[PDB]
Amino acid sequence: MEEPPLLPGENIKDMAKDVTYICPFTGAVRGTLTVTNYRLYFKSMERDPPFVLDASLGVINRVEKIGGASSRGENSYGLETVCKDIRNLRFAHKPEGRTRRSIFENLMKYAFPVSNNLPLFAFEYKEVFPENGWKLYDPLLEYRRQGIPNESWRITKINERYELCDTYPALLVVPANIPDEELKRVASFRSRGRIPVLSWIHPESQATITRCSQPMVGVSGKRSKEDEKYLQAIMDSNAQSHKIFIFDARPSVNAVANKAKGGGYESEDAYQNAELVFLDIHNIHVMRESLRKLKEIVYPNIEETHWLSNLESTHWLEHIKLILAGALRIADKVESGKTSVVVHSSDGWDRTAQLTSLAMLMLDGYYRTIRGFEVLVEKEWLSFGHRFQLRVGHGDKNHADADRSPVFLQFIDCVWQMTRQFPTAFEFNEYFLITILDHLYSCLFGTFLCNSEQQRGKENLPKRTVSLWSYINSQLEDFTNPLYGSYSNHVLYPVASMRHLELWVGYYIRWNPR
Ligand SMILES: CCCC(=O)O[C@H](CO[C@@H](O)CCC)COP(=O)(O)O[C@@H]1[C@H](O)[C@H](OP(=O)(O)O)[C@@H](O)[C@H](OP(=O)(O)O)[C@H]1O
């Protein structure tokens, strides 16, 4: 029997007999196509181990009608689902079978519930696990683990009602001597009120990683005494009071383009004890275009003759390299330079989240534990306002949205690169990372829904959805790396080179039955 298995809360919405799945690798196979509220299940008993294709609906970007009435070929009348996970799926229907319309309509409806005024499956997934992923991350405790608040850094509550910055977490760590009303001001100079706050502190040197958005300098060199005092306050916090380093993730010309617009960067006149460096990491649009090119040379057949040159033309591994190289520069400046660094971009959610979290992964072994990693994600990504729902387009039929970009995917890709370079340094395994990427799109859990901490609170995700961590941690074994424990040498320093970075076959090329 060709019925899909059903998760608690999941159910069949449509079924189709005698549909043909056209496997680019194994030719065609006739079986039964089923659509649930969660998934797209195809299964044929026309083979042996029965043929099964199980794909969560969340990965579907587009559903196209293939062929028409004037389609007289064989397997020319059908559907094609364009996926988010580096594949496209296509099925053939018989016109007289009268199933294509029903399937097409149910796919459109259940793969894009938000566009059809329906819930995302996460709200109807009523499975129950022993551990509760929602209680895993505790801002206050994480800060405490870092030896936060101390004399130099305090915790303010000025953003508890999300009034200071609605895309920031409720609790913020700032210089022990900067008053709430002053912060209220730096917030006026920083884009979207995303002021420089603490992300990490060296246990020893008390060199810091702070994060923020760009300074609203504009065409005319606008300055903020308070912002300048703020960055100064950050420097006065290092017991070996060098200076400051400001890493602008952006290429130079982008930073300037932004300045025309109203944004900009910290000049050497305005911020003196500050050294600014541009990391040349392009925007969300460039990264979307890069992944698009990659999917083409990867998905169905790879053209072996020109793989290397084709891969180069995508500029994928290059973006990955600049992101890791950037994280490296930050880590080194903190660790070896004993210097505090301020990280930003334009808005400070995207590239900034990539940099802080990777540098933090290089510097703090805690973040390399399975559970530590989950916290890093909850912290740097979720709590700090990476716009997941927007960047992925959860249950939204508008596949051409310019807001869609694989920012988090790049991050995970960079994390994977480090596991390759340091196979004993991480407690989690590849499966763990790939699983994370699958549920990033699945919308089975509420972990990657909404766009800010505030929103997830108002939506009451902890109570209405299951945390991905609940599933993962009540399972640890599937996601544990056996070689772990030995990275006594505590600062990871991967090599960001085109010769040391590989294309993540495990993820981008996993559909081939080899
Ligand atoms: C004051 C200027 C502010 C700004 O961000 O402007 C730029 C655009 O300008 C043109 O398109 C028009 C020029 C007339 C974009 O400048 P730019 O740096 O090229 O690009 C940003 C950057 O990628 C942000 O992430 P982050 O900085 O955290 O890594 C995204 O969130 C933002 O998109 P979204 O949030 O709106 O979806 C995107 O526009």
CA 33 to centroid of ligand 1, rounded, Å: 42
Query: Do residues 63 and 111 make contact, with C-beta atoms less than 8 angstroms apart?
Result: yes
Q: State the distance from the centre of ligand 1 to the C-alpha of 346, rounded, in angstroms.
A: 6
Cα-to-chain-centroid distance, residue 291: 14
- The two tokens of residue 34 are 């089923």
Token pair belonging to 173: 């760590």
Assess whether 441 and 389 both reside in one domain: yes
Quick check: is 22 in a domain? yes
Resolution (A): 2.0
Given a contact cutoff of 8 angstroms between Cβ atoms, the answer to whether 260 and 230 are in contact is no
Q: Are residues 182 and 241 in the same domain?
A: yes
H or E element that contains 199? strand 197-201
Say yes or no: 299 and 442 in one domain. yes
| Protein residues whose CB sits closer than 6 Å to any atom of ligand 1 | 249-250, 254, 258, 261-263, 283-284, 345-352, 403
Domain membership of residue 28 (yes or no) is: yes
Residue with tokens 């606008």: 222
Whether residue 301 sits in one domain with residue 277: no
Residue 286: alpha-carbon gap to chain centroid: 16
84 and 106: one domain?
yes
Query: Do 332 and 440 lie in a common domain?
Result: yes
Residue 6 lies in a domain: no
Distance CA 510, CA 106 (A): 27
Q: Which residues contact 107 (CB under 8 A, 6 or more apart)?
A: 35, 40, 57, 60, 63, 79, 81
Contacts of 221 (CB under 8 A, 6+ apart): 267, 269, 270
Which of the listed residues 111, 135, 165 is the one where a domain comes to its end?
Answer: 111
**Same domain, yes or no: 94 and 243:** no
Sheet with 244-248, strands from edge to edge, namely 197-201, 208-211, 341-344, 244-248, 274-278
Domain count, the chain: 3
Contact status, residue 263 vs residue 344, Cβ threshold 8 Å = no
Closest CA to 387 of 467, 459, 456, 444: 456
Answer whether residue 21 is part of any domain: yes
Assess if residue 459 is contained within a domain: yes
Q: How far is residue 83 CA from its own chain's centroid?
A: 17
Closest-CA residue to 453 (of 444, 445, 462): 462
8 Å CB contact between 341 and 331: no
Question: Are 314 and 395 members of one domain?
Answer: yes
C-alpha distances out from residue 31 to 21, 42, 90, 253, Å: 8, 7, 13, 54
Angle at the Cα of 508 (from 393 to 42), degrees rounded to 5? Answer: 70
Backbone dihedral region of 86: left (phi > 0), alpha (psi from -120 to 50 degrees) or beta? left
User: How many Å apart are CA 284 and CA 288, to the nearest integer?
Assistant: 6
Q: How far is the CA of 387 from the centre of ligand 1 (A)?
A: 13
* Nearest protein CA to atom 22 of ligand 1, as residue: 283
Asked if the structure places residue 359 within a domain, the reply is yes
Locus of tokens 């990539």: 354
Atom of ligand 1 nearest to the CA of 281: 29
Distance in Å, CA 455 to ligand 1 centroid: 22
Do 173 and 232 reside in the same domain of the chain?
A: yes
**Ligand 1: centre distance to CA 173 (Å):** 26
Report yes or no on 2 lying in a domain.
Answer: no
Using the 3D structure, point to which of 323, 347, 371 is the last residue of a domain: 347
Q: Edge-to-edge strands of the sheet including 39-44?
A: 51-56, 39-44, 27-36, 12-23, 88-92, 78-83, 60-66
Q: Considering only CA atoms, which residue is closest to atom 27 of ligand 1?
A: 346
Closest by CA to 101, choosing from 118, 117, 79, is 79
- What are the angstrom distances between the C-alpha of 391 and each of 141, 166, 283, 349? 29, 18, 12, 11
The amino acid at 338 = K
Determine, yes or no, domain membership for 1: no
Final residue before a domain boundary, out of 111, 138, 167: 111
Does the CA dihedral 437-443-448-449 come out positive or negative?
Answer: positive
Q: Report yes or no: 244 and 231 within 8 Å, Cβ to Cβ.
A: yes
**311 and 448 assigned to the same domain:** yes
Task: Using CA atoms of 397, 400, 401, 406 in order, give the dihedral in degrees to the nearest 10.
Answer: 100
Q: Solved by what technique?
A: X-ray
Ligand 1 pocket test, pick from 217, 282, 283, 289 with the greatest ligand atom count within 8 Å of Cβ, gives 283
| Secondary structure (H, E, C), 297-344 | HHCCCCCHHHHHHHHHHHCHHHHHHHHHHHHHHHHHHHHCCCCCEEEE
Breaks (C-N over 2.5 A) in the chain follow: none
Domain match, 435 and 334 both: yes
Q: Which atom number of ligand 1 is nearest to the Cα of residue 390?
A: 37
In terms of residue numbers, what domain contains 33?
Answer: 11-111
Instruction: Answer whether 191's CB lies under 8 Å from 346's CB.
Output: yes
| One domain, residues 24 and 37 | yes
Residue nearest to atom 9 of ligand 1 (CA): 258
